[PDB]
Amino acid sequence: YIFSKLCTFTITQKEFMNQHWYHCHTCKMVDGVGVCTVCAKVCHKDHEISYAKYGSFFCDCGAKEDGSCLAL
Ligand SMILES: [Zn+2]
Ligand SMILES: [Zn+2]
Ligand SMILES: [Zn+2]
């Protein structure tokens, strides 16, 4: 995919690609909902996060329609 340092939603939109992603128990982003590597570091700093898996995914942090993601 393209080079970017931002949230991978930048790359995927609501289509999917293989990537590492995380759960956030603080934000109740669990099961099939989670966050990309950038958002885990930035938007969820000091939250209770955990590794989910590597697989087909788009970032639900970047996808939040209120624009609260800090990683574009
Ligand atoms: Zn993200
Ligand atoms: Zn969180
Ligand atoms: Zn984010």
Numbering used by the authors: 1656 to 1727
Quote the authors verbatim:
The N-end rule pathway is a proteolytic system involving the destabilization of N-terminal amino acids, known as N-degrons, which are recognized by N-recognins. The E3 ligases of the UBR subfamily recognize and degrade N-degrons through the ubiquitin-proteasome system. However, unlike other UBR proteins, UBR4, despite having only the UBR box domain, can recognize both type-1 and type-2 N-degron. Our findings suggest that the UBR box of UBR4 recognizes type-1 N-terminal arginine and type-2 N-terminal amino acids containing an aromatic ring, such as tyrosine, tryptophan, and phenylalanine through pi-interaction with two phenylalanines of the UBR box of UBR4.
Therefore, we attempted to determine the structure of UBR4UBR in complex with YIFS to investigate how the distinctive feature of UBR4UBR observed in its apo structure affects ligand binding and how UBR4UBR can recognize type-2 N-degrons. To overcome this issue, we purified the protein with the N-terminus starting with tyrosine (YIFS-UBR4UBR) using the LC3B tag system. Using this system we successfully established the crystal structure of YIFS-UBR4UBR. We found that the N-terminal residue of one YIFS-UBR4UBR molecule binds to the ligand-binding site of another. As expected, the first amino group of YIFS-UBR4UBR was bound to the carboxyl group of Asp1715 and the oxygen atom of Phe1713, as in the other UBR boxes. However, unlike the structure of the arginine-bound UBR box of UBR1 and UBR2, the direction of the N-terminal tyrosine residue was not toward Asp1721, but toward Phe1671 and Phe1713 in the binding site. These two phenylalanine residues on the ligand-binding surface of UBR4UBR create a hydrophobic patch, which explains the binding ability of residues with aromatic rings. Between Phe1671 and Phe1713 of the YIFS-UBR4UBR and Tyr1 of the ligand form trimeric pi–pi interactions, and Phe1671 and Phe3 of the ligand form typical T-shaped pi–pi interaction. In these pi–pi interactions, the distances (Rcen) fall within the range of 4.7 to 6.5 Å, which is the typical distance range for the pi–pi interaction. The presence of pi–pi interactions can greatly enhance the preference for amino acids containing aromatic rings, such as tyrosine.
